[PDB]
Amino acid sequence: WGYGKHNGPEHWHKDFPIAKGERQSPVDIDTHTAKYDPSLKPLSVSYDQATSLRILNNGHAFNVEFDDSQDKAVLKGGPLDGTYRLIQFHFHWGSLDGQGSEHTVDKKKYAAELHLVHWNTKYGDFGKAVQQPDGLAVLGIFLKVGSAKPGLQKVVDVLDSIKTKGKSADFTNFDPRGLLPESLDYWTYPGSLTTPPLLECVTWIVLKEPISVSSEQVLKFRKLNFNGEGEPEELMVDNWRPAQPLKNRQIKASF
Numbered sequence: 001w002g003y004g005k006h007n008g009p010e011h012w013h014k015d016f017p018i019a020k021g022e023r024q025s026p027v028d029i030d031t032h033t034a035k036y037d038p039s040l041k042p043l044s045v046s047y048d049q050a051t052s053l054r055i056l057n058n059g060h061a062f063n064v065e066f067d068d069s070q071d072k073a074v075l076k077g078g079p080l081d082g083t084y085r086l087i088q089f090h091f092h093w094g095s096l097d098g099q100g101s102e103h104t105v106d107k108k109k110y111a112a113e114l115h116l117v118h119w120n121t122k123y124g125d126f127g128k129a130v131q132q133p134d135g136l137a138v139l140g141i142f143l144k145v146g147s148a149k150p151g152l153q154k155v156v157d158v159l160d161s162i163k164t165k166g167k168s169a170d171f172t173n174f175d176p177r178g179l180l181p182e183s184l185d186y187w188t189y190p191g192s193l194t195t196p197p198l199l200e201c202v203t204w205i206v207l208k209e210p211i212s213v214s215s216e217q218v219l220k221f222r223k224l225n226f227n228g229e230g231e232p233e234e235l236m237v238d239n240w241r242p243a244q245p246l247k248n249r250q251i252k253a254s255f
């Protein structure tokens with residue numbers, strides 16, 4: 001699977017029939033249908049002891065991986081019951097600034113979207129968590145093009161070294177706190193992974209406030225390759241799934 005005409009989102013349902021499921025992601029967030037929910041508790045992003053390990057081009061995106069052997073970087077609160085450990089983050093982005101995000105807001109597409117993936121520690125390990133309807137929590141953050149995001153620059157700086165599928169590099173001592181906007185105001189809804197196997201295990205928490213990144217930063221994302229070394233170059237761009245049917249779901253606002 002991939003993002004091209006012959007292996008892209010329109011084809012995924014043949015190997016992963018859940019692609020046409022009842023709680024697929026992403027979705028369009030219609031701000032006039034989302035309802036404030038005063039029962040939501042404050043979101044707690046606890047990343048002070050985060051332990052990043054490595055950055056990997058997996059042919060679909062680049063992934064910054066963390067040590068999730070212990071409660072070191074966790075998400076709690078909000079719509080969540082319990083504790084969810086950060087395992088990795090990645091981005092989706094476009095070929096041009098007017099597309100790239102997976103979620104949309106009143107049909108607006110942002111230039112890119114950051115996903116911080118967390119699993120529910122009550123299930124012991126990630127593999128067990130993704131067999132549960134509350135196994136994962138993904139914090140989604142939109143990127144727009146404006147001023148540079150200083151906290152993103154160390155990421156941008158290493159991409160030269162993982163240009164092709166299968167390449168990795170040490171990426172210790174990275175602080176993901178530097179990727180957040182000021183506000184933790186969010187929308188939440190039950191959904192899925194947005195990549196095969198498209199498992200319907202995720203509590204989505206999508207921040208309302210985008211972060212700004214510079215044109216130079218996003219241009220460096222677009223120099224990555226989907227292909228492996230020595231293979232013909234296919235630029236890693238437009239690695240986003242479009243909005244899926246909302247079906248019988250409710251999107252709730254924390255604000």
Ligand SMILES: NS(=O)(=O)/N=C(\Oc1ccccc1)N1CCOCC1
Nearest residue numbers: 058060061088090115117193194195
């Ligand atoms: N939006 S997402 O489904 O989280 N994307 C991904 O799914 C996962 C699956 C497991 C752990 C973290 C993320 N990625 C990024 C692209 O390469 C495939 C893996």
Ligand SMILES: [Zn+2]
Nearest residue numbers: 090092115194
């Ligand atoms: Zn993602």
